[PDB]
Amino acid sequence: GVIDTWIDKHRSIYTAATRHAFVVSIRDGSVDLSSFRTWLGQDYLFVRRFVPFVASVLIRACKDSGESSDMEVVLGGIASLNDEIEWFKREGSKWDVDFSTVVPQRANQEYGRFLEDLMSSEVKYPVIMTAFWAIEAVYQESFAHCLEDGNKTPVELTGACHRWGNDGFKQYCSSVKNIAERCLENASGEVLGEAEDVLVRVLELEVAFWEMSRG
Numbered sequence: 308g309v310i311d312t313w314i315d316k317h318r319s320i321y322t323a324a325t326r327h328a329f330v331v332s333i334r335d336g337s338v339d340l341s342s343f344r345t346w347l348g349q350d351y352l353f354v355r356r357f358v359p360f361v362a363s364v365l366i367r368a369c370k371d372s373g374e375s376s377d378m379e380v381v382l383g384g385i386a387s388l389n390d391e392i393e394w395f396k397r398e399g400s401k402w403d404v405d406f407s408t409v410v411p412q413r414a415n416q417e418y419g420r421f422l423e424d425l426m427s428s429e430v431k432y433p434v435i436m437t438a439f440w441a442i443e444a445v446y447q448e449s450f451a452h453c454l455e456d457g458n459k460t461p462v463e464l465t466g467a468c469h470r471w472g473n474d475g476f477k478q479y480c481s482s483v484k485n486i487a488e489r490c491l492e493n494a495s496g497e498v499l500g501e502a503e504d505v506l507v508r509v510l511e512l513e514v515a516f517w518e519m520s521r522g
């Protein structure tokens with residue numbers, strides 16, 4: 308399909324944009340949580356920005372109707388964000404990470420602004436859904452196999468891998484993909500073009516975000 312054609316056409320930054328969100332390591336014989344804590348912090352401030360973004364996509368699916376179930380595909384996504392956002396607060400506390408004292412970095416402050424460029428009524432629904440999809444898919448792709456490759460490393464940190472690696476999120480990202488795919492399948496030269504620039508564009512930010520915490 309239209310999307311796989313694009314990912315397989317762009318497997319490139321996609322792969323770059325789809326490498327493990329945080330690694331874990333060993334130094335002076337102590338588990339090193341350097342990337343993990345960097346990722347937790349930066350990913351929490353974005354998630355706070357991602358929330359109203361999706362809000363604006365929910366409002367659009369309700370008025371840029373194609374199917375009745377679209378809003379529920381989106382409504383659930385946003386729904387887990389309540390628990391996901393709650394999960395970030397528990398982690399902040401058990402890992403001694405102070406969110407009020409996190410400094411949003413360039414590749415993050417920037418994502419704050421881009422999501423904003425999607426909140427405007429001027430952007431076409433198919434473009435917006437493509438972004439909302441890609442953003443899911445990348446974290447799903449970044450977190451697949453994790454559990455399994457989790458027992459192939461010294462000390463595994465598993466709390467995240469469970470949140471974005473479970474079978475419920477895989478099929479959620481999927482109900483979301485089913486929509487995107489149905490929309491792009493009608494977009495006229497103007498809008499489609501606008502979309503692919505966006506798929507490849509979500510990957511660019513995921514890559515420059517992923518570098519903040521590299522290990």
Ligand SMILES: Cc1ncc(CO)c(N)n1
Nearest residue numbers: 350353442443446513516
């Ligand atoms: C950068 C980034 N992309 C996607 C997600 C979650 O889907 C996240 N938490 N952060």
